[PDB]
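Researcher: Final request for today, and then I'll write up notes for the group meeting. The sequence and the SMILES for praseodymium ion follow.
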Amino acid sequence: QDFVAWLMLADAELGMGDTTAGEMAVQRGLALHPGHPEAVARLGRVRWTQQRHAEAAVLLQQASDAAPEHPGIALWLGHALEDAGQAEAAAAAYTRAHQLLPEEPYITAQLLNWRRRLCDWRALDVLSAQVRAAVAQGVGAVEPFAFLSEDASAAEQLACARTRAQAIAASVRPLAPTRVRSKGPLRVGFVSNGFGAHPTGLLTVALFEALQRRQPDLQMHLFATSGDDGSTLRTRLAQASTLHDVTALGHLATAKHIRHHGIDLLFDLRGWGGGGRPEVFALRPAPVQVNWLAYPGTSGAPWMDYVLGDAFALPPALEPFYSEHVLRLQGAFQPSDTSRVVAEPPSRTQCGLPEQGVVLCCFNNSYKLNPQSMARMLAVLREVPDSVLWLLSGPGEADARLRAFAHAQGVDAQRLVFMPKLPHPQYLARYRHADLFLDTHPYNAHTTASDALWTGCPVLTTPGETFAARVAGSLNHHLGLDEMNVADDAAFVAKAVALASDPAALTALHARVDVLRRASGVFHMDGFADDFGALLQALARRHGWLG
Ligand SMILES: [Pr+3]
Ligand SMILES: [Pr+3]
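Model: Predicted protein-praseodymium ion complex:
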């Protein structure tokens, strides 16, 4: 008979992740107080939990109409709206949660992250300060990955990661410890949700193919937390490795499965570092666990032993800000899919571009396009009459917001051209119309910069003071294109303006990229497989391995 006892239990069971118990419990609440916004909100949260997002959004909107002053309801509504594809409506929901409970950092940091994704820069500096103060206060309430978008030092990034990671570790009893095998093929595991048409699969696919034919004494095992999406990438990854389907298993079941296969070296390619539900790692299923590639910064985590970088992106100066022990490959830390044919795209006119203007390109995630990166790009357009800025179309009204900013910055908004979303092969052919790629700060282009360079387009960047701000720089360095890493925004603008107004010099720079992309080691994955493989053998030899 206890209505509130029912729901609270509802939430309890859902917290566990327990399915039908939580719902059963909700069903009993609504029978006692029909329409009640708490029960109703809760039934929406069940649905969202059952991943029925549209039904989830319907229920929560109802609840939210019946209790519009309630901050938790407003938050949960934002969660469902987001997962239902309703981006702008998601934003209004978070905005209202935040207004109602500004005291709550978790909500503040959700709002901020979603605002950046929409290019909505209202209260940007204020929300950003609050999030940075929450890190300093040691709560663990901001997500490490979302934190990479802020311009904060390597030291703050470490504080954010380790406070989050230690929150997890405190509530996980690891598995009993094991050790690297002494004899037999080395088993090297990689855990990811991006084994498919996602950056992780895309970057590593040709590497795994090279390791297969070149490193006999090593077995690559992929543990895929997502199902087969039908992409060529997922299929090439499964033929090049032993690919285990661990999708929809709990964290304990997954850890037990990795331990059952005797994984010696386990790589976190999940993309979340110490955040995003890394309890498979906190359980320590593998004797040696390594952070590489998918998250560009430190895990801060007591369960992570090594991080894999390179001399440019992770120089000696930056080492103390990593909780992991630092290992370095001999060239760039980042592989790429050097099997890819670049098609001829349709004409410039067919892609929405002037045929006769300089096209500056910044294909990047929307949350990377902040006021600083945009202002410096628009400063190039003001100095160079016939140039245009080519961007990826963003979620919500992000493009409309960028047009307004361009207008407010003295630039005709029709000079921004937005590419819609295309399958990878079609997206990649577009680079053939790009004259210069303009990198962002402080979170660089990662896959989009190696896509640009593979197609022969030069990348301009200002290497900064965190790993995530040095990724594009590292590519240039290892390619041999050091003059395209410049000091600061003012040199960024002068180099771009000089290049954009000297088409003969820019032509000569495209010629240089062409030669360097063949003569450097950046796009030889056989060489990358030899280095990576040798480094794997030494890490293991070092913990007991004997071949
Ligand atoms: Pr052509
Ligand atoms: Pr051209």
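Model: The CA atoms of residues 205 and 392 lie 24 Å apart. The longest strand covers residues 186-192.
Researcher: Thanks, that's everything.
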